[PDB]
Short mmCIF file of C-alpha atoms and ligand atoms in Angstrom, two decimals:
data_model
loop_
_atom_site.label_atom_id
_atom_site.label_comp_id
_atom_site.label_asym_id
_atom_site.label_seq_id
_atom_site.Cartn_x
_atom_site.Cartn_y
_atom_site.Cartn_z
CA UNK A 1 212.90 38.66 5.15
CA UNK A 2 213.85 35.73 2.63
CA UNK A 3 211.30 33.46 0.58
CA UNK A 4 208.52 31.51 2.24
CA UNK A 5 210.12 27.86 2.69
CA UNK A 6 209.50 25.64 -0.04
CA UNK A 7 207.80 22.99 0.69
CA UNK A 8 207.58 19.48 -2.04
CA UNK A 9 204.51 20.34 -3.29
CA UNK A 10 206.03 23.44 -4.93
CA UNK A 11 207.95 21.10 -7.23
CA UNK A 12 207.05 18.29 -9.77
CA UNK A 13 210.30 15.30 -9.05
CA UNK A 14 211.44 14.07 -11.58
CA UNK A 15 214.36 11.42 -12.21
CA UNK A 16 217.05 10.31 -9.57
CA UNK A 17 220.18 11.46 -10.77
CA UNK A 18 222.10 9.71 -8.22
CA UNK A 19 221.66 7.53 -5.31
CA UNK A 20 224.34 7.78 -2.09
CA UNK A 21 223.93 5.45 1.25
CA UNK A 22 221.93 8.16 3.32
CA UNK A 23 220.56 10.21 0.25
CA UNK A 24 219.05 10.31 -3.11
CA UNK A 25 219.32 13.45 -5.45
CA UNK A 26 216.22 13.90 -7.66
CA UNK A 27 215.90 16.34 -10.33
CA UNK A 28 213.18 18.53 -9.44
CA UNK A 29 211.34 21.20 -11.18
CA UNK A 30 209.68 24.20 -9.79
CA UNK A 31 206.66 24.68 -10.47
CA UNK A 32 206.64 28.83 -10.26
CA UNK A 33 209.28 29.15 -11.61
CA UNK A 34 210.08 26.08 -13.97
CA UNK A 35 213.71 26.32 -12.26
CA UNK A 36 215.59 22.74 -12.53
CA UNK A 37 217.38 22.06 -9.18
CA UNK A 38 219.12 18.78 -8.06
CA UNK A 39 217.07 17.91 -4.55
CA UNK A 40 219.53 15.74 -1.94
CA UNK A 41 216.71 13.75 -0.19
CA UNK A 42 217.89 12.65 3.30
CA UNK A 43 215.53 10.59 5.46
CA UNK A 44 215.78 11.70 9.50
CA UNK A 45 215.29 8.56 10.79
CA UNK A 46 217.70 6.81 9.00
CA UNK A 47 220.90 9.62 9.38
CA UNK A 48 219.68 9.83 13.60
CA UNK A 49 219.92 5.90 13.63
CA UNK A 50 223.10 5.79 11.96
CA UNK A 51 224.63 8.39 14.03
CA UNK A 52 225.55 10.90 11.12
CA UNK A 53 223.79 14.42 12.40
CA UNK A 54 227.23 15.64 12.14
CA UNK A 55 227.95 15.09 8.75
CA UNK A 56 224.54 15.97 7.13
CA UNK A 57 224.44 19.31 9.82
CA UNK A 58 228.47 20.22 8.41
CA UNK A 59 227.60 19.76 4.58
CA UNK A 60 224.61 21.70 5.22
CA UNK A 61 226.95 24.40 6.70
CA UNK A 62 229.39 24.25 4.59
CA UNK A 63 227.66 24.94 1.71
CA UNK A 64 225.95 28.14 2.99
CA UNK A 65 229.58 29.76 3.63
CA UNK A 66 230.54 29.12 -0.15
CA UNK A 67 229.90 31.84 -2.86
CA UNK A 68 232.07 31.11 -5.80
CA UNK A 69 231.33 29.63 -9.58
CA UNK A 70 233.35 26.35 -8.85
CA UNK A 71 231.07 24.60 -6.00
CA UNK A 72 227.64 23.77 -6.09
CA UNK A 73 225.12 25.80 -4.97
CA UNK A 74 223.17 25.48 -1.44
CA UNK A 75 219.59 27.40 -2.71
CA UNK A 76 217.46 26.50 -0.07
CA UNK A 77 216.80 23.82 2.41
CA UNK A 78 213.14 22.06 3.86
CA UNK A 79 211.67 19.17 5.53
CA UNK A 80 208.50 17.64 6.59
CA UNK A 81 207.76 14.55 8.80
CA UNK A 82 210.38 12.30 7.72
CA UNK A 83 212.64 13.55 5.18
CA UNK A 84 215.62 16.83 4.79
CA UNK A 85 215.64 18.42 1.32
CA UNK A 86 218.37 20.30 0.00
CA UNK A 87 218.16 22.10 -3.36
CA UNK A 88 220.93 22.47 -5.35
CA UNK A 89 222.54 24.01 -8.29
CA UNK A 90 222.11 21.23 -11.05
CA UNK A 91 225.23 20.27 -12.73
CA UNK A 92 223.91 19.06 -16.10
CA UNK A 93 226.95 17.34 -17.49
CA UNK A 94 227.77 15.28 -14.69
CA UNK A 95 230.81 13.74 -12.86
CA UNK A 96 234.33 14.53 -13.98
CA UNK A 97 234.91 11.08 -13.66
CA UNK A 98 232.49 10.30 -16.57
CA UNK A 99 234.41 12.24 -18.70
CA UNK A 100 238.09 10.15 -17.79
CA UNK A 101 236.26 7.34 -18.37
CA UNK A 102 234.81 8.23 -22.25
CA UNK A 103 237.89 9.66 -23.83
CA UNK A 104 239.98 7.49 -21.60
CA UNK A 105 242.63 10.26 -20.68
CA UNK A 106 243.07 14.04 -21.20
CA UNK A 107 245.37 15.95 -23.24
CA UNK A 108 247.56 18.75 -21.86
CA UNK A 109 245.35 21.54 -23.27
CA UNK A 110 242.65 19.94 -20.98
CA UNK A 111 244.75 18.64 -18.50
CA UNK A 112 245.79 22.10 -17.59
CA UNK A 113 242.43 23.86 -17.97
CA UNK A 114 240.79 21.73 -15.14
CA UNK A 115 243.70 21.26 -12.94
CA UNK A 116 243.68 25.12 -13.12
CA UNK A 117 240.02 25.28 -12.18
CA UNK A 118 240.64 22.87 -9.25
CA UNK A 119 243.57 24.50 -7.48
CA UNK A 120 241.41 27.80 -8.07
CA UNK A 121 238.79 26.49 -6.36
CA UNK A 122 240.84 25.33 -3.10
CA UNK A 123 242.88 27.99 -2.74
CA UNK A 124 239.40 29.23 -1.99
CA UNK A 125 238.09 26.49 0.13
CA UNK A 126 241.41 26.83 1.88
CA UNK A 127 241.56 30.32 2.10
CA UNK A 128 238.07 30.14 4.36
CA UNK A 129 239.83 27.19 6.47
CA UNK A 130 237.65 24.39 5.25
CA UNK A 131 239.72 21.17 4.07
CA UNK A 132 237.63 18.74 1.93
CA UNK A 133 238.82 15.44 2.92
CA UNK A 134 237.32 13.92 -0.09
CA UNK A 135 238.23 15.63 -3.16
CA UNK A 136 237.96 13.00 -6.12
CA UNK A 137 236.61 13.03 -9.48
CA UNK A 138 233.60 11.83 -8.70
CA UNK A 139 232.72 15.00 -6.38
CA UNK A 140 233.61 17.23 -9.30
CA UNK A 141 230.80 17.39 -11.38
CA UNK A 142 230.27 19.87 -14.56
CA UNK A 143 227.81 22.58 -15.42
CA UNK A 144 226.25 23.27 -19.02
CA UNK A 145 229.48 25.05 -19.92
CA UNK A 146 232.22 21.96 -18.72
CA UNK A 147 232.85 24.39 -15.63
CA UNK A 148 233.51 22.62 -12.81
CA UNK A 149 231.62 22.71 -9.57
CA UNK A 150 233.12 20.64 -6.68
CA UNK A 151 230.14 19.12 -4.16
CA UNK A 152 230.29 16.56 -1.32
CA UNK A 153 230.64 18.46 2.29
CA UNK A 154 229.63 16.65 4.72
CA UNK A 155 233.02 14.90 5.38
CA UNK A 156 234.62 18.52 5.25
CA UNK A 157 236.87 19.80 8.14
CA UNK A 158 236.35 23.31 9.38
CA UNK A 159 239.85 24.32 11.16
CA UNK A 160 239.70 27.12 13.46
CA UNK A 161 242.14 29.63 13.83
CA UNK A 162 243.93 28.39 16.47
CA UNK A 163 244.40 24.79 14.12
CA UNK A 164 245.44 23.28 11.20
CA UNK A 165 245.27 19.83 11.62
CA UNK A 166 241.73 18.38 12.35
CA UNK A 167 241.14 14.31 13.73
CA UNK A 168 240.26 12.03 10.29
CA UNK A 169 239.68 8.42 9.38
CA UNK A 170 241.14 7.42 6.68
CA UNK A 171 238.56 4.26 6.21
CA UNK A 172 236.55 7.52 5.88
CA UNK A 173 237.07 8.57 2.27
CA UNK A 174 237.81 6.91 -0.54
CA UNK A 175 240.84 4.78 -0.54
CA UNK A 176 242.51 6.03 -3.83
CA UNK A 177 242.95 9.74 -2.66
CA UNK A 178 243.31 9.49 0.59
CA UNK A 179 246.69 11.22 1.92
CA UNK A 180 249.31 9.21 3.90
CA UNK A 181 249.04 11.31 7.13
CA UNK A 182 245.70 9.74 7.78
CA UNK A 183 246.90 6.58 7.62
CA UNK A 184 249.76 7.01 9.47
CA UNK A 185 248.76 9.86 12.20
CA UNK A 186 244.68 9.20 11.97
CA UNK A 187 244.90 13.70 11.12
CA UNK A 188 244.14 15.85 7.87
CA UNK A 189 244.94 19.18 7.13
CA UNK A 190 244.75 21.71 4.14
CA UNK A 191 247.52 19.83 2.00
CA UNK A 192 245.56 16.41 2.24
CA UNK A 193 243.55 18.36 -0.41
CA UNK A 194 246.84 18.93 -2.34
CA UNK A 195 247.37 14.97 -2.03
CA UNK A 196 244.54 14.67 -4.06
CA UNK A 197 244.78 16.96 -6.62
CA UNK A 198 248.23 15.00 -7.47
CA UNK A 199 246.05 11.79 -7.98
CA UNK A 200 243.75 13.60 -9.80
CA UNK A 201 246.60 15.60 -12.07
CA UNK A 202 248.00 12.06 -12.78
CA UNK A 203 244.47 10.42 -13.24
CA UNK A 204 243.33 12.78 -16.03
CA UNK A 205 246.90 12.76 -17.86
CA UNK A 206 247.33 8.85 -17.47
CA UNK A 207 243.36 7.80 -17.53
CA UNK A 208 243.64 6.20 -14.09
CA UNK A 209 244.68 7.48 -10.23
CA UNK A 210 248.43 6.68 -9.52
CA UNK A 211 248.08 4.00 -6.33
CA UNK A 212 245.53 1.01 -7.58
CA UNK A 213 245.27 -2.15 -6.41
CA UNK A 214 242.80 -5.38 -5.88
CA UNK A 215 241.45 -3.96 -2.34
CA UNK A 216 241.82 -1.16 -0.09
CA UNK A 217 244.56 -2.41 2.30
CA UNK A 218 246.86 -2.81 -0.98
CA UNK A 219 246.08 0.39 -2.19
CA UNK A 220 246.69 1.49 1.42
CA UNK A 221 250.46 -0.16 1.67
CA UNK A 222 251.31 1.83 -1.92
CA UNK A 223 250.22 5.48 -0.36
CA UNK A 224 252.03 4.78 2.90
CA UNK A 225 255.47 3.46 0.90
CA UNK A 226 254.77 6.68 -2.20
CA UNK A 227 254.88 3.39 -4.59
CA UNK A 228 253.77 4.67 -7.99
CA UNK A 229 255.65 4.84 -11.02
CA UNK A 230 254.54 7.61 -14.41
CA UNK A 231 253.49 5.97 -17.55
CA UNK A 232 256.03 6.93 -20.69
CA UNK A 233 254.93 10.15 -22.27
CA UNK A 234 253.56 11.45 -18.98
CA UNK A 235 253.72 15.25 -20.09
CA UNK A 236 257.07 16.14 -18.51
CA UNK A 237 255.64 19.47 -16.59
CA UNK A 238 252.75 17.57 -15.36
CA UNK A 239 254.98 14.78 -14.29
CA UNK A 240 257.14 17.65 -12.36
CA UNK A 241 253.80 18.92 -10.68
CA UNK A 242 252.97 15.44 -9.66
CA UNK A 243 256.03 15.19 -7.77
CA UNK A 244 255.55 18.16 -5.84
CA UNK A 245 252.14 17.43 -4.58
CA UNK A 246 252.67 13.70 -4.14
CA UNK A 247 255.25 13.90 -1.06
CA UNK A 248 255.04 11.94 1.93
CA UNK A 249 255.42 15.00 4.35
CA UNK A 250 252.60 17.29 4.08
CA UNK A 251 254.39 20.41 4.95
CA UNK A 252 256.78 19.99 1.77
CA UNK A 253 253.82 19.64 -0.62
CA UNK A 254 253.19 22.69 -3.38
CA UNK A 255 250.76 24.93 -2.01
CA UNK A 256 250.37 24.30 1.29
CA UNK A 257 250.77 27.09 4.06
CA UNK A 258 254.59 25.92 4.57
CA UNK A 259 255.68 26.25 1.31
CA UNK A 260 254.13 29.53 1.21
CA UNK A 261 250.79 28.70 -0.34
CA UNK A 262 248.96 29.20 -3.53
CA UNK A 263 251.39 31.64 -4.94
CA UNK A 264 254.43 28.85 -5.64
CA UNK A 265 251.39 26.27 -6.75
CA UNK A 266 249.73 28.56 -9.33
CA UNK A 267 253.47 30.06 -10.72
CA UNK A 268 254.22 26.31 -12.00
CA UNK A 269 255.67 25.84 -15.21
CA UNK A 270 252.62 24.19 -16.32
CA UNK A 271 250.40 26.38 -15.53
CA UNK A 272 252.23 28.86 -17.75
CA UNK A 273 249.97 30.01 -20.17
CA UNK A 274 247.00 30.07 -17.38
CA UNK A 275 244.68 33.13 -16.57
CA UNK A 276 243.94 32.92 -13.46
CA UNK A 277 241.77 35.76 -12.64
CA UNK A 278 238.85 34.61 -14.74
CA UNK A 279 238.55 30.81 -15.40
CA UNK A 280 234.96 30.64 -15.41
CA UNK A 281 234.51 33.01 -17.97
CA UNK A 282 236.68 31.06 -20.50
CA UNK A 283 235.39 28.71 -22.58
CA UNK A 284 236.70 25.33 -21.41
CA UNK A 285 238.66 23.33 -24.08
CA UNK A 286 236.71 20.68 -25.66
CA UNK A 287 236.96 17.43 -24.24
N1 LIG B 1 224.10 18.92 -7.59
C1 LIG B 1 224.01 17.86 -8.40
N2 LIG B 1 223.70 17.94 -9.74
C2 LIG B 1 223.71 16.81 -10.55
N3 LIG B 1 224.04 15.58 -10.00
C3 LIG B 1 224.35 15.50 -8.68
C4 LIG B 1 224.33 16.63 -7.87
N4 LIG B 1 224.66 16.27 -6.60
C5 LIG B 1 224.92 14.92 -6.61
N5 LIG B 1 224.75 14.45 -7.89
C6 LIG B 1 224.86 13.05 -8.33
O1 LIG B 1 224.14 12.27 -7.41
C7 LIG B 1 225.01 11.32 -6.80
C8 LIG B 1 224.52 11.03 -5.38
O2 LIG B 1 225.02 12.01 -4.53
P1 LIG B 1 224.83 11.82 -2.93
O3 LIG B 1 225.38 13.09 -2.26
O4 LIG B 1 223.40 11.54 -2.66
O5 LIG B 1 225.62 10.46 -2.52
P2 LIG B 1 227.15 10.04 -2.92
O6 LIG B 1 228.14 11.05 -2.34
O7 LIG B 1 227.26 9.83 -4.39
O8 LIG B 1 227.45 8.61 -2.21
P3 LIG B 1 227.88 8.46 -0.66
O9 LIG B 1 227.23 9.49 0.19
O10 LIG B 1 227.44 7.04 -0.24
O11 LIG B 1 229.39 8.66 -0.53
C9 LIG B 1 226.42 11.88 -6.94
O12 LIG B 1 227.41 10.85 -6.85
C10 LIG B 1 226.30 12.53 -8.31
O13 LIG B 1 226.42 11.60 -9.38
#
């Protein structure tokens, strides 16, 4: 026997914290209690008209099957007439990306604590056979600590055993991070993540995501062709990472189930002076 569903009268809304194209996330507090939560807002008609059941019914699932400090938290879900509401941990500090923007680029004490918390956090996502597909900066938001907690499922894959590849569009995503294979063979699998955390490694050292251009079909030609070049000063084990994750074959990438997995990854020389065990129980270096 759980908790009687909430319903929105139990809470007094407060301020949209963000605003996507079939959602809105409200800060919301309840009123017995005066627990913050971040309530996703999701109108029926709208996601049955636009033909996205699937996505909002898989980041609904998704969530549930995740227990661990670096995703956010699914507490409860309820509707009424018109609208799905899912409460969620609130991540006070915001998007990573917030962060790359104000101090423009990280240093390698920070560099390494959050790339550390990242591949921590899919070598568990991986390790229950769920790949992302959209694993950006912007889907890494921050808890009162500067802990990370990664969000945005509904685009996830869920490979079954049999599997590990799983149909993709890579118009679906965002164009920056998405991984050659699903431009080239319309398919994602576990080390599309891996893809991404190489952007993201190079994006936090450099202050900007390694394959830009003026519009998507650009940015598109320079995934598909690996053209990106390190800034001077890129720190030289970082760079080294980079270039294991960013590789055109997704069976030769670090950490993927080919290369024998999260063992090789997390054993990089620049992750030397990690602790793995217990990341979220470290105080993350100041920013
Ligand atoms: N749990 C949360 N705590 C604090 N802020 C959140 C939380 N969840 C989402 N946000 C913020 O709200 C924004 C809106 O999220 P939402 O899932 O509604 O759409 P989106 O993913 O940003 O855009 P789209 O769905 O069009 O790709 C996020 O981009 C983020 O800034």
């Amino acid at each position: 026997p759980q908790p009687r569903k909430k319903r929105p009268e139990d809470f007094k809304f407060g301020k949209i914290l963000g605003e996507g194209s079939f959602s809105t996330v409200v800060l919301a507090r309840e009123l017995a209690t005066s627990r913050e939560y971040a309530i996703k807002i999701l109108e029926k008609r709208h996601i049955i008209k636009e033909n996205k059941v699937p996505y909002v019914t898989r980041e609904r699932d998704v969530m549930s099957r995740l227990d661990h400090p670096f995703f956010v938290k699914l507490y409860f879900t309820f509707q009424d007439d018109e609208k799905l509401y899912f409460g969620l941990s609130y991540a006070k500090n915001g998007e990573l990306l917030k962060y790359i923007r104000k101090i423009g680029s990280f240093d390698e004490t920070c560099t390494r604590f959050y790339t550390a918390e990242i591949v921590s956090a899919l070598e568990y996502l991986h390790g229950k056979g769920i790949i992302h597909r959209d694993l950006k900066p912007e889907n890494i938001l921050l808890n009162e600590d500067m802990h990370i907690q990664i969000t945005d499922f509904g685009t996830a894959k869920v490979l079954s055993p049999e599997s590990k590849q799983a149909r993709a569009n890579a118009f679906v995503g965002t164009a920056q991070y998405v991984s050659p294979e699903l431009l080239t063979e319309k398919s994602a699998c576990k080390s599309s993540d891996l893809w991404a955390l190489g952007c993201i490694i190079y994006q936090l050292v450099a202050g900007l995501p390694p394959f830009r251009a003026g519009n998507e079909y650009l940015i598109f030609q320079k995934i598909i062709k690996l053209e990106y070049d390190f800034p001077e000063k890129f720190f030289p084990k970082a760079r080294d990472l980079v270039e294991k994750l960013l590789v055109l074959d997704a069976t030769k990438r670090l950490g993927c189930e080919e290369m024998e997995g999260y063992g090789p990854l997390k054993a990089h020389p620049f992750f030397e002076s990690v602790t793995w065990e217990n990341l979220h129980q470290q105080t993350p270096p100041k920013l």
